[PDB]
Ligand binder design. Structure first.
Ligand SMILES: C[S@@+](CC[C@H](N)C(=O)[O-])C[C@H]1O[C@@H](n2cnc3c(N)ncnc32)[C@H](O)[C@@H]1O
Ligand SMILES: C[S@@+](CC[C@H](N)C(=O)[O-])C[C@H]1O[C@@H](n2cnc3c(N)ncnc32)[C@H](O)[C@@H]1O
Ligand SMILES: CSC[C@H]1O[C@@H](n2cnc3c(N)ncnc32)[C@H](O)[C@@H]1O
Ligand SMILES: CSC[C@H]1O[C@@H](n2cnc3c(N)ncnc32)[C@H](O)[C@@H]1O
Lengths: 124, 124
């Protein structure tokens, strides 16, 4: 069959607003055992993404805020997207996770390289 | 065919000793655009692993040293190991990368979930 994003995505999505501190973002990553944190506006629409790597960058380069360190051009997926299209996308942009969004940029889940790697292993 | 670790692994491995600071570890992750840092002893043998998530944990929980935060029971792979065995391993232990070691625990490379996800996408 063709596996789609909606078959493997993690939900509900864990998200945050851009006004939390870097320490607060780190705490969310640890609490939920995740490496990806989509940043959303007051209407729940995607404005950026924070990963563990960005938290490491903040330490390495003396960065101060989430707004300063978040990636604003976020590569995303749709729930009907074939998982292999997403894998190719992540490889092309050298990234490790993609928020799943609806047509109005609301976050409905996330697919990471760990989810796709898991799929690879259970297919065998 | 059967794809093996040696067909897809990243080398040379980027490693560090346990006596570097947390900031210094973060700097290595940023410099090399990676999320995994195998920690090795003076003979190059694996003693632990640091990831971006651990750097985030250090901030979240006021941790002080690499020795304090590194994971010591490291799940590893061999170069002749089928990539799908590795994917299953990473899923089982909920981890995102595995150092590739020889029979005497010397680090010869690393395979991450991004490498396996890439493999998934190019297979289509
Ligand atoms: C370009 S990657 C390279 C290092 C490694 N391959 C990784 O994925 O972390 C590092 C940057 O990817 C960004 N990133 C992660 N997921 C993203 C996404 N879905 N869209 C855009 N950027 C993303 C992070 O914010 C981080 O600044
Ligand atoms: C259990 S994972 C769960 C969160 C997420 N799945 C991830 O991979 O980061 C978090 C821990 O995995 C540990 N880890 C990463 N790679 C590892 C490996 N090859 N062997 C043992 N532990 C590893 C990291 O040191 C970190 O403390
Ligand atoms: C970030 S890697 C941790 C695993 O948990 C899930 N995950 C990652 N980030 C989030 C998030 N922001 N919200 C919910 N689940 C997530 C992903 O599907 C991944 O396989
Ligand atoms: C950590 S995810 C970044 C990518 O670069 C490679 N990489 C990760 N960690 C290391 C490392 N310690 N040394 C060399 N390459 C690495 C991995 O194969 C991965 O696909």
């Amino acid at each position: 069959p063709i596996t789609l994003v909606k078959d493997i995505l993690s939900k509900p999505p864990i998200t945050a607003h851009s006004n939390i501190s870097i320490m607060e973002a780190a705490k969310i990553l640890i609490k939920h055992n995740i490496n990806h944190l989509p940043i959303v506006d007051e209407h729940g629409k995607l404005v950026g993404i924070i990963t563990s790597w960005d938290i490491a960058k903040a330490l390495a380069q003396n960065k101060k805020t989430i707004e300063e360190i978040m990636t604003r051009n976020v590569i995303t997926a749709h729930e009907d997207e074939p998982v292999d299209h997403v894998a190719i996308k992540m490889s092309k942009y050298n990234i490790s996770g993609v928020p799943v969004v609806d047509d109005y940029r609301r976050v409905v889940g996330i697919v990471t390289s760990e989810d796709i790697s898991r799929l690879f292993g259970g297919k065998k």
